């Protein structure tokens, strides 16, 4: 294997041979690839049209190098709620708020996240401004999970060897296949998730990766471009279950949600976004709450999918009940307070 | 303009807006572009499908930054004989030998060239092994042209600001749009040329660039893969005249040439390739001579094409007569000896 061989194949517009994507990603992760090689690979792979086998190879290599959580500290039914980012909107941190509510409903959550790349505040930025410790290592994330019901795996802490790819990602600024890897490389390897993808023609490939892993996942793209289930219009859902994918259109109005306008979901810096989380968890009614509940419900449906029994329309109704209730009872607000406290008691 | 804007447009598979390619090449030529951005641009441009406008912009920027020859030192009808390289075949130096014969026929030759990038011995390597000064500056190239009838512009000597792009080209190893630039950026800007292209899919774009400039050029690709007019089979020629491109297939059997096998054109290191130059210039008959006479005749046909009155078959017959006579009379052999002396004598 070599860069000339692998890059030549992608520029010739051919799928890679088995193991070639893995070889390249491993070269990148061990500090053996030049920035020019990283960049050419990321770009060539994107314009060829990456396959699920290829992206799955990249994610596998990352996960090989990642710091794992201690043996037996992650429940079999843990869920993630996370997206690619890069939708270019300023939204409040919808995946993060949704994650808190899901954990409050009693579904164990191990969230993978990161600071903003192009938006004003990312999930990690907002959690830090809420006073949550984003910087915890594996042992402490396990304890957070067990003690609070939610853990946060901060991407740079668990994937230090991604530094070179990350620098290339920043320098080129254009989204590539690398922008898919975050939701695919949660170091705790939870088996279910609500997974947002900003790139309409890469979502199916993401779903394919999860299918191969036999995860129960909803990969979601809002038809307004949000890497979240949206309230402004319909969303496309790639439903992953029993190792297979099917594409659905999802209509929040079908459940009773008023249509919102994207400016109603608008964000600010980390201080503003933190105040939006507090408002939502404090019971403020309106568009932010609606989108949070929808997205929490979606994650609860992915969790339910870890069973044969799981049935689409009933799963949603129950997910929506549970998400609403976790906020209404104050369970979500109290969980956030307990999470903040946990991090202060070292 | 920005890298995110330009790279995004290319990865969306869209042609650039006018001036975007020029902006990017200029960033690259002024040391303002990171290796990652250079590589991402070269790759995305190649996979999109570069246009003649875009490639012409790259070449125009390179020519803007190149060392020029002094005013009024390059005759109106100077010719180049040069290819992309990158054919992955190990040939004797056909363009270089052709160039010497063409000069000896009395057509002024200002050759752009470079050391090998992936073959054993490139034009510049072989010229160096023959005792020719390859790295003369603008003023001495002009004097060489006036006194010997041929000058050689060494690419690193005339395009110092391409240094960063060149390092990226070698690091990625795969051919890109950058590989087209050599034959398109001769600093003496001759108006005619026999131009070899190893990349069948890009040769038409090279021809378009020459058409825009109103050059009289034959862009050639041997149907065996050579960036030269081959003697082993037919060649595709994109004939450039009166600012238009005509695609032709050319068969040397039409002029009485015997088919050769590719192994008969096989080269070696610079010493072996230098000895093959002397053997051809000394009158040795065989396949190598045939390939040199054919390519010389091709450069002479491109030269004739600077006149609107030139006709194709008579131009070929005259080109072949002139190329053959230049060897047989000893004029090509003497010209090489004079070139060597010129470099030794200041
Ligand atoms: O700056 P951007 O490239 O637009 O990225 C926006 C955020 O989306 C992703 O996280 P996540 O889905 O966990 O965050 P959320 O709470 O903002 O939805 C990513 O980790 C960023 O934090
Ligand atoms: O290492 P490669 O990428 O295969 O390139 C082989 C040579 O071809 C080009 O020159 P030119 O056409 O002037 O050389 P020639 O005499 O060998 O035909 C290029 O400048 C190299 O010198
Ligand atoms: O540059 C990335 O995509 C990336 C790749 C591998 C690991 C982590 C990230 C950061 C991230 C985490 C979670 C969501 C989005 C982005
Ligand atoms: O290396 C350089 O500094 C350089 C600068 C300007 C022109 C040519 C080259 C050399 C080169 C060798 C092989 C491929 C491409 C380029
Ligand atoms: O090939 C390149 O990267 C290149 C680009 C711009 C200028 C010069 C070269 C080197 C060259 C000169 C002549 C023929 C082939 C190659
Ligand atoms: Mg999100
Ligand atoms: Mg989002
Ligand atoms: Mg050549
Ligand atoms: Mg050649």
Curated annotation (Swiss-Prot), chains A, B:
Enzyme class: transferase
Binding site for anthranilate 1: 83, 114
Amino acids binding Mg(2+) 1: 95, 228
Catalysed reaction, written as an equation: N-(5-phospho-beta-D-ribosyl)anthranilate + diphosphate = 5-phospho-alpha-D-ribose 1-diphosphate + anthranilate
Positions contributing to 5-phospho-alpha-D-ribose 1-diphosphate binding: 83, 86-87, 91, 93-96, 111-119, 123
GO biological process entries: L-tryptophan biosynthetic process
Gene behind the chain: trpD
PANTHER family: ANTHRANILATE PHOSPHORIBOSYLTRANSFERASE
Pathway: Amino-acid biosynthesis; L-tryptophan biosynthesis; L-tryptophan from chorismate: step 2/5
EC number per UniProt: 2.4.2.18
Name under which the protein is recorded: Anthranilate phosphoribosyltransferase
Similarity comment: Belongs to the anthranilate phosphoribosyltransferase family.
Keywords: Amino-acid biosynthesis, Aromatic amino acid biosynthesis, Glycosyltransferase, Magnesium, Metal-binding, Transferase, Tryptophan biosynthesis
One GO CC term on file: cytosol
Keyword Magnesium in annotation: yes
Cofactor: Mg(2+)
Quaternary state and interactors: Homodimer.
Textual note on the cofactor: Binds 2 magnesium ions per monomer.
UniProt: anthranilate 2 binding residues: 169
Function as written in the Swiss-Prot or TrEMBL entry: Catalyzes the transfer of the phosphoribosyl group of 5-phosphorylribose-1-pyrophosphate (PRPP) to anthranilate to yield N-(5'-phosphoribosyl)-anthranilate (PRA).
InterPro entries hit by this protein: Anthranilate_Pribosyl_Tfrase, Glycosyl_Trfase_fam3, Glycosyl_Trfase_fam3_N_dom, Glycosyl_Trfase_fam3_N_dom_sf, Nuc_phospho_transferase
Pfam families with a match to the protein in the record: Glycos_trans_3N, Glycos_transf_3
